[PDB]
Structure 1
Amino acid sequence: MQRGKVKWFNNEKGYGFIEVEGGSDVFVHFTAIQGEGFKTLEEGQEVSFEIVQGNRGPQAANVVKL
Structure 2
Amino acid sequence: MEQGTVKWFNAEKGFGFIERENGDDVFVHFSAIQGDGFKSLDEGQAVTFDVEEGQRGPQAANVQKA
Larger-gyration structure (1/2):
1
What is the TM-score of this pair, normalised by structure 2?
0.43
Greater relative CO, 1 or 2 (CA 8 Å, sep 6+): 2
What is the TM-score of this pair, normalised by structure 1?
0.43
- The structure with the greater share of residues assigned to helix is 1
